[PDB]
Amino acid sequence: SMAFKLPALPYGMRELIPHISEETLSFHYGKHHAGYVNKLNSLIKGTPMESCTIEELILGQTGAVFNNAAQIWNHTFYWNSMGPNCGGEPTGPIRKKIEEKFGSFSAFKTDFSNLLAGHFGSGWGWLVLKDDGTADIVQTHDAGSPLKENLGRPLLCCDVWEHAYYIDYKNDRLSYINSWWNLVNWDFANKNLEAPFKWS
Amino acid sequence: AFKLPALPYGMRELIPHISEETLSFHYGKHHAGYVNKLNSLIKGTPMESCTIEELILGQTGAVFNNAAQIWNHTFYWNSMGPNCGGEPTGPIRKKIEEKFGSFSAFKTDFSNLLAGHFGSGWGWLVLKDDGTADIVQTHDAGSPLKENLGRPLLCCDVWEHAYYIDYKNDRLSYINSWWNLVNWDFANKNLEAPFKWS
Numbered sequence A: 001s002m003a004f005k006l007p008a009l010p011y012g013m014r015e016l017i018p019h020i021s022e023e024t025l026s027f028h029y030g031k032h033h034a035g036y037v038n039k040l041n042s043l044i045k046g047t048p049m050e051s052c053t054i055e056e057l058i059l060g061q062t063g064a065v066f067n068n069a070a071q072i073w074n075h076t077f078y079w080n081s082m083g084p085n086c087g088g089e090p091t092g093p094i095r096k097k098i099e100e101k102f103g104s105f106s107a108f109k110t111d112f113s114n115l116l117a118g119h120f121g122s123g124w125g126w127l128v129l130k131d132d133g134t135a136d137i138v139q140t141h142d143a144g145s146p147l148k149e150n151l152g153r154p155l156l157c158c159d160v161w162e163h164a165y166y167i168d169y170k171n172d173r174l175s176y177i178n179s180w181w182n183l184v185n186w187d188f189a190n191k192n193l194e195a196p197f198k199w200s
Numbered sequence B: 001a002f003k004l005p006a007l008p009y010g011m012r013e014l015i016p017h018i019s020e021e022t023l024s025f026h027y028g029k030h031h032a033g034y035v036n037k038l039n040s041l042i043k044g045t046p047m048e049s050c051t052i053e054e055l056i057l058g059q060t061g062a063v064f065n066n067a068a069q070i071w072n073h074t075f076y077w078n079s080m081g082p083n084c085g086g087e088p089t090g091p092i093r094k095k096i097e098e099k100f101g102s103f104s105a106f107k108t109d110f111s112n113l114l115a116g117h118f119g120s121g122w123g124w125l126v127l128k129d130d131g132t133a134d135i136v137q138t139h140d141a142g143s144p145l146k147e148n149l150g151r152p153l154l155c156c157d158v159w160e161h162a163y164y165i166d167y168k169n170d171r172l173s174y175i176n177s178w179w180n181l182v183n184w185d186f187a188n189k190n191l192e193a194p195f196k197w198s
């Protein structure tokens, strides 16, 4: 089979408690993310797109094929941007990049929280490495991709589609954002500084 | 400045199709929030004396988003009711059968539109300028008024907050429940004269 496969979650579904619940991971990974994979496969089965990489589909396609391919990528990136036993202050190369751009971790936390809180409708917040070598924050809408929009190399992302938080926080996206800081996986950011993430 | 218009029914009256908890957040937090945010955005500005429709037609950005969502949600509550649903009645039945052939065909076509909308948005039954019914969608806070898609007759919210409490990812089950709530009397009122927000 040439079908795309959903990459494994990097942790069990209870490991992000109390910040993101079991029930949220069960639906967000088990229904939404799994759903994007199944839908993409349905759309490209028997077509010449069958042998494309996910990045090739993101860069080269539009419409439903784009939307599903990009969401598959974005969610895999999201799960890796979080973890159990993470959070807290940035360490290593990403700490230097954050200080160089924002002056301090606290300023970054303020700016990125405001960006995440401010996004209207469905979308994503990203910490990226720009071509000039400096860090920045950007947002995309719906399935929007920093790859397609050439916004920089993704380092971390936070999903602000309502399904990411509604089970646990209902309309209170700000409490979800505050909780997400307890989960952020700086090691993933540091790996992405070494080399761009390639989906597999 | 603007006040949130009262729900047309009690918050337990759409059970078992939409829960009390859903209405408490969707009306009490989201819809109320758009009113509060709009009021804070326009206070002390020349926009403070504009009608909701005027803000929808003449502004962009956050003022538009909040103004349009206020209108869209009020339209949504009126598009539903207790002891409604079922097959269409009155003049809207006629227009539906003329355009779509049968109610069953309409229900399939509009359900597919609602199910297929990617991201946050709205589905609408409208009256076009040629006097025929049609179905259209808008994205995020998009308004049929601003995009000149026809006169709104009914709408269904497919932002995830409209259904996540009750149906989680299963928007199709939410859509099927919405059909049990559809208020054909509101559609027929809107055929006689366009809805004016108050």
Ligand SMILES: [Fe+3]
Residues within 6 Å of the ligand: A028, A032, A075, A159, A161, A163, A164
């Ligand atoms: Fe998501």
Ligand SMILES: [Fe+3]
Residues within 6 Å of the ligand: B026, B030, B073, B157, B159, B161, B162
């Ligand atoms: Fe809504």
